[PDB]
Structure formats: C-alpha cells, structure tokens
C-alpha cells in the first residue's frame, strides 16, 4: 500500500466489532490483541554471537510491519477493495458487506434483512478464533518450526568445530 | 495464459488497477508484460442509503448503488458516476422498510401514468 | 539411508573413524526424514481435501 | 551543502479517509495506465 | 493481494467456504490471515424442474 490509512476515532461499522484486530493505543506497543498473542506465543536467540556468526537486524522493525498491517486493515474497513486498485473510496461497511454478498452470488437484500445477525456472528467468530489461539499451542507451528530448524542448523554448524578430524585437539593454536 | 489470453479477476496480478488486457514482448532470456489497467481518477462526496422505501416495500439496486447530489436521489454504477432516475427496472422490491436501518423514504416514478396519458 | 551403514559396513574401525567427523550422519538422516514427512504431507493435502 | 543523512524511513504518507455510515465516493473520471512487468524465463545456460 | 485487497473467486484459496474478506496480522517472521467465509448452514428437500 502506497499510503497509510487509519480508522476514524469513532467506531460505527453497523454493529461490526474490530477491536480484536485493530491496534490498542493503551499499551505502549501499537499492535492488536491477536498480534500481541502471536508475539507472546513465540519463545537460542540471544546466544548467536560467539565465533563469527552475526544476526543482521531486520530492515523493517516489528513496529513498521504492525503499521503496515494497521493501514491495510483501515483501508479494507473504510473503503474495501477500491484502495488496492487506485484511489481509496470510502463506503459504509454494511454496503461493503452487501457488495461482497453480491460477489459470492447471494442477493443484496438478505444482508440488510438481518444485518444484526451477521454482525453478531462475525463478532462471535472473532472471539472464537481468539479463544482458540489462546488455548491452542499448535496454531503457530509453522513459524516455530522454521525458527527451530534455523536454530538447530546454527547449533550443528557451531558444534561441527569440536570435531578434531584426527588432530590432537580442535584448537588451532594448541595443535 | 491469464492476463494476455483472457481477463484476470485477480487483484494486482496483471498490474495495479482493474486489468483490461496485456501485451507480451520478448527480451534476452526474459519476457515483458505491458499490463493495461483501468484506474478511477476523480472522486466526489455522495450521500448513499442501503435501500429506498416507496410504498412500504424496500427497494434495492439491481446493479449499482444509491447516491444523492444533496437533494435528489439517483442510482449509479459502482466504478463510474452515471446517475439514473430511480425506476422499477433499476431497483428490485423486497420485504418492508421497517426492518432495515438507514432506509430513507423516497418517490419512485412509474412509466404507467405517462404511458396511459396518451 | 543409514549413514553409518552405507559409509561403514559392520566395521568397528570405520565407525570409530566416522564418529570423529561429527554429526554429518545425523544431519543426513534428519534431512531424509524431513523429505519423507514432506512427501506424506503433500499426498495428504493434495488428496485429503 | 548536500550530504549523506540517515533517518527513520516513513512508510508512506498518512491518510485519513472521511468515513461515515452514509457517505460514499463514486469516481467520475478514469485513466488507462500501462505498467511494465519484467519476468526472467530462461538463464545463461551452459555445459 | 487477492483475499485482502479484493474478493477472491478461487475455491479453498482464502479459507474454505465462500470467501468474503480477510484481515492480515503480523507475527514473528510470518503473517496470519483471518479469512471470513460465508457457509450454508441449514438445508431442505425441494422438488425442482
Ligand atoms: C441534483 O440533480 C438533479 C437532476 O439533474 C437536479 O434537478 C434538476 O437539475 C437541473 C439542472 O440543469 C435543473 O435545471 C432543474 O430545475 C432541477 N430540477 C429540480 C426539480 O430541482 C438538482 O437540481 C440537483 N441538485 C443539486 C444540489 O445539485
Ligand atoms: C489537512 C490538515 O492537515 N488538516 C489538519 C486539521 O485536521 C487539524 O484539525 C489541524 C490542527 O491544527 O491541522 C490541520
Ligand atoms: C437528538 C437526536 O435525535 N439525536 C440522535 C442521537 O441520540 C443518536 O445517537 C444518533 C444516531 O446516529 O442520531 C441522532
Ligand atoms: C467490541 O468488543 C470489545 C470487547 O471485546 C468492547 O469493548 C467493544 O465495545 C465492542 N465494540 C463495540 C462497538 O461495542
Ligand atoms: C468527502 O468529504 C470529505 C469532507 O467533507 C473530504 O475530506 C473528502 O475528500 C470527500 N471525499 C473525497 C473522495 O474526496
Ligand atoms: C432430502 O430427502 C432425503 C430423503 O427424503 C433425506 O434423506 C435428506 O436428508 C433430505 N435433505 C436434507 C437436506 O435433509
């Protein structure tokens, strides 16, 4: 996204609740509750500086990535798909959901007939995914597995030096 | 296969914007695509309502959205401003307007009176 | 592939010599096991839909 | 006297979309943009 | 590009069911997508011609 979008101070999306996905100003870190849970869930990190190994810093700090995600969320909420294909155009979230329903072949009117039901279902689903992430430890298996694989590869590379390969000792100076 | 031989609905696949067509060109050990994209340019404020109530029955746009130039109400395309007079052809009827929130009372012209005027 | 067996055929001396090299055999076995698990996951995801 | 300056990068320009429950933005004019996309196909194959 | 910035018509791409929209979220060296999907719930017999 070329620009940065932010939701209006007042959150009136026709009963839709996005507090669980939007950043929390109260906490010092401007990240959403789900993002905070994901960060806390992930736990051979600070010991990677002994024998020439260095960990170059990430170009995009977690704050910048969080800002990008927040901008994408604000654009999607306030405009929909328009901001992703040119100038961002505002539209009520109810009308955006109606457009989506038309896109998936469902008639528009149905959404306006029970908008409260859809809003409640969306909020319940958000709460359910939050609870599942909180109470489930295998949800983030991919990232943890990748980190563990990198850490064990580094550890094996470091430990390979211990091998003497027939020498009296692995220390170059001593031999 | 997608952008050139057809129109791709994927977003940001055949370039940024609403893809219309693509043109391939060769290059040393590579290809170049000149993606043509429609992109909205000029925007404008408008007041819109989810539906219109005429005679106790909710009215929803068959294809478009309701907008208002301050006083009058029209139905216009989503990606272009082409206001049209509200008529039974433009919008379809459903239920009653007492259920939806945000519906605004309005009048819908009927061709039957001018047709019978003769 | 059993790295110890392929490199050393029921030979105590060859195994003792390989033990000095390091954890090459363990790394190769882990890579092969990961490949097998990846094949199983590919089959499951492509078919068990 | 221009020189080298280090700074914290700005991730674009902040935008505040005028969103409300009964406000929309319907475009009135359009443009046709031609964008280039370069994609390698083969490489400097050798034997 | 597809699920977030638009409505994907592909099947089982942005989550199973009729995709509507997705909300990206950051994570350590990764991303998380919350795909919203419309799914039919209650069915009934009908005689059709
Ligand atoms: C909103 O658009 C309608 C439709 O064009 C306008 O209604 C007519 O506008 C023409 C403009 O040439 C006038 O000559 C007519 O007298 C208008 N008819 C009526 C009954 O007012 C309307 O004026 C527009 N309103 C605004 C605020 O732009
Ligand atoms: C276009 C723009 O920058 N507008 C702002 C305005 O919203 C704000 O109230 C004011 C405060 O000084 O500063 C200016
Ligand atoms: C005087 C009056 O009618 N005020 C109401 C206000 O109470 C309500 O919260 C708002 C809803 O948007 O509409 C207006
Ligand atoms: C959304 O839920 C939070 C608690 O999870 C609540 O504080 C907030 O008020 C809800 N949204 C609205 C619009 O009430
Ligand atoms: C809609 O109106 C607001 C303020 O009235 C303005 O800031 C905004 O730019 C308008 N919409 C567009 C697309 O410009
Ligand atoms: C349709 O009818 C059959 C037999 O009458 C029944 O088994 C089936 O459950 C019906 N459909 C649904 C969705 O229940």
Is the CB of E24 inside 8 Å of chain B's CB atoms?
Answer: no
Cβ contact A109–B16 (<8 Å): no
Question: Measured between alpha carbons, how far is A147 from C6 in angstroms, rounded to an integer?
Answer: 31
Interface residue of D19, D20, D24 to substitute, partner A, most A CBs within 10 Å: D19
Question: Measured between alpha carbons, how far is A75 from A77 in angstroms, rounded to an integer?
Answer: 6
Determine the 3-state secondary structure of E23 from DSSP.
strand
CA distances from B7 to A53, B19, B38, D33 (A): 49, 7, 12, 16
Contacts of D26 (CB under 8 A, 6+ apart): A89, B43, B44, B46, B65, B67, B76, B77, B78, B80, B81
Of residues B47, B58, B54, B56, the one with CA closest to residue B92: B58
Resolution in A: 2.9
The CA A146 to ligand 2 mean position distance, Å, reads: 46
- Establish whether chain B is in contact with chain A, requiring a minimum of 3 CB pairs below 8 angstroms: yes
Please give the method by which this entry was determined. cryo-EM
Cβ contact A160–C20 (<8 Å): no
Q: At what angle do helices A115-135 and A33-41 cross, to 10 degrees?
A: 20
Query: Which DSSP category does B117 fall into?
Result: H
D34 half-sphere exposure, CB direction, 13 A CA radius: 6
Question: Measured between alpha carbons, how far is B34 from D46 in angstroms, rounded to an integer?
Answer: 30
Pairing between β-strand B104-105 and β-strand B52-53 as defined by DSSP bridges: parallel
Question: Which secondary-structure segment (H or E) carries B9?
Answer: none
Question: Which secondary-structure segment (H or E) carries E31?
Answer: strand E30-38
Pairing between β-strand B58-61 and β-strand B45-46 as defined by DSSP bridges: unpaired
Q: Quickly count: other Cβ atoms within 10 Å of residue A112's Cβ.
A: 26
- The answer to whether B21 touches D16, Cβ cutoff 8 Å, is no
Cβ contact B13–E6 (<8 Å): no
Residue nearest to atom 7 of ligand 4 (CA): A19
- The answer to whether A92 touches B48, Cβ cutoff 8 Å, is yes
- The answer to whether B62 touches B55, Cβ cutoff 8 Å, is no
Question: Measured between alpha carbons, how far is A15 from A11 in angstroms, rounded to an integer?
Answer: 9
Indicate if the alpha-carbon torsion angle E29, E34, E35, E40 is positive or negative: positive
- The answer to whether A133 touches A34, Cβ cutoff 8 Å, is yes
Number of residues in chain A:
175
Task: Annotate C4-25 with b (16+ C-beta within 10 A) or e (fewer).
Answer: beebbeeeeeeeeebeeebbeb
Q: Does the beta carbon of B42 lie inside 6 Å of ligand 5?
A: no
Question: Measured between alpha carbons, how far is E16 from E33 in angstroms, rounded to an integer?
Answer: 13
Task: Annotate D32-47 with b (16+ C-beta within 10 A) or e (fewer).
Answer: ebeeeeeeeeeeeeee
Token pair belonging to A42: 């992930």
Of residues B65, B51, B64, the one with CA closest to residue B95: B51
Residues of B in contact with D22 (CB under 8 A): 47-49, 102
Q: Which long-range contacts (CB under 8 A, 24 or more apart) does B84-89 make?
A: B85/B109, B86/B52, B86/B59, B87/B111, B89/B62
Q: At what angle do helices A33-41 and A62-78 cross, to 10 degrees?
A: 150
Question: Measured between alpha carbons, how far is B31 from D39 in angstroms, rounded to an integer?
Answer: 5
Determine the 3-state secondary structure of C7 from DSSP.
helix
Q: What is the DSSP string of chain A?
A: --SEE---SS--STT---TTTSB-SSSSS--BHHHHHHHHH----TT--SSS---PPPSS-HHHHHHHHHHHHHHHHHTTTGGGGSS-----HHHHHHHHHHHTT--HHHHHHSHHHHHHHHHHHHHHHHHHHHH-SSTTHHHHHHHHHHHHHHHHHHHGGG--TTSS-S-TTT-
Question: Measured between alpha carbons, how far is E24 from B11 in angstroms, rounded to an integer?
Answer: 16
The H-assigned helical ranges of B26-72 are none
Query: Which DSSP category does B87 fall into?
Result: B
Minimum-distance CB partner of D19 among A1, A8, A68: A8
Compute the radius of gyration of chain C from its Cα atoms.
16
SS (H, E, C) C17-43: HHHHHCCHHHHHHHHHHHHHHHHHHHH
Is the CB of B78 inside 8 Å of chain E's CB atoms?
Answer: no
CA distances from A20 to A38, A128, A131, A155 (A): 13, 11, 11, 38
Number of residues in chain C:
49
Residue B98: Cβ-neighbour burial (10 angstroms; 0-12, 13-18, 19+): exposed
- The answer to whether B13 touches B2, Cβ cutoff 8 Å, is yes
Interface residue of A60, A73, A76, A98 to substitute, partner E, most E CBs within 10 Å: A76
């Amino acid at each position: 996204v070329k620009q940065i979008y932010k939701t209006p101070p007042i959150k009136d999306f026709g009963g839709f609740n996005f507090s669980q996905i939007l950043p929390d100003p109260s906490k010092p870190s401007k990240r959403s509750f789900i993002e905070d849970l994901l960060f806390n869930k992930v736990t051979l990190i600070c010991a990677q500086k002994f024998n020439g190994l260095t960990v170059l810093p990430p170009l995009l700090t977690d704050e910048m990535i969080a800002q990008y995600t927040s901008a994408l969320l604000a654009g999607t909420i306030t405009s929909g798909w328009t901001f992703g294909a040119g100038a961002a155009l505002q539209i009520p979230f109810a009308m955006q959901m109606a457009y989506r329903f038309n896109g998936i072949g469902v008639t528009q009117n149905v959404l306006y007939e029970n908008q409260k039901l859809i809003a409640n279902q969306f909020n319940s689903a958000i709460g359910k995914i939050q609870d599942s992430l909180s109470s489930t430890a295998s949800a983030l298996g991919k990232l943890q597995d990748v980190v563990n694989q990198n850490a064990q590869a580094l550890n094996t590379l470091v430990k390979q030096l211990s091998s003497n390969f027939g020498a009296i000792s692995s220390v170059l100076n001593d031999i | 296969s997608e952008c050139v031989l057809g129109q791709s609905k994927r977003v940001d696949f055949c370039g940024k914007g609403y893809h219309l067509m693509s043109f391939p060109q060769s290059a040393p050990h590579g290809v170049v695509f000149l993606h043509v994209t429609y992109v909205p340019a000029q925007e404008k404020n408008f007041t819109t309502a989810p539906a219109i109530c005429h005679d106790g029955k909710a009215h929803f746009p068959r294809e478009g959205v309701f907008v208002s130039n301050g006083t009058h109400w029209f139905v216009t395309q989503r990606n272009f401003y082409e206001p049209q007079i509200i008529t039974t052809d433009n919008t379809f009827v459903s239920g009653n307007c007492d259920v939806v929130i945000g519906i605004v009372n309005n009048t819908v012209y009927d061709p039957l009176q001018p047709e019978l005027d003769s | 592939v059993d790295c110890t067996m392929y490199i050393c055929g029921d030979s105590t001396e060859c195994s003792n010599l390989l033990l000095q090299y390091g954890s090459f055999c363990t790394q190769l076995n882990r890579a092969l096991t990961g490949i097998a698990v990846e094949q199983d996951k590919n089959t499951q995801e492509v078919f068990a839909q | 006297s221009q020189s080298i300056i280090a700074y914290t990068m700005s991730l674009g320009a902040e935008n505040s979309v005028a969103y409300s429950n009964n406000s929309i933005a319907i475009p009135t004019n359009f443009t046709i943009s031609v964008t280039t996309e370069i994609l390698p196909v083969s490489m400097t194959k050798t034997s």
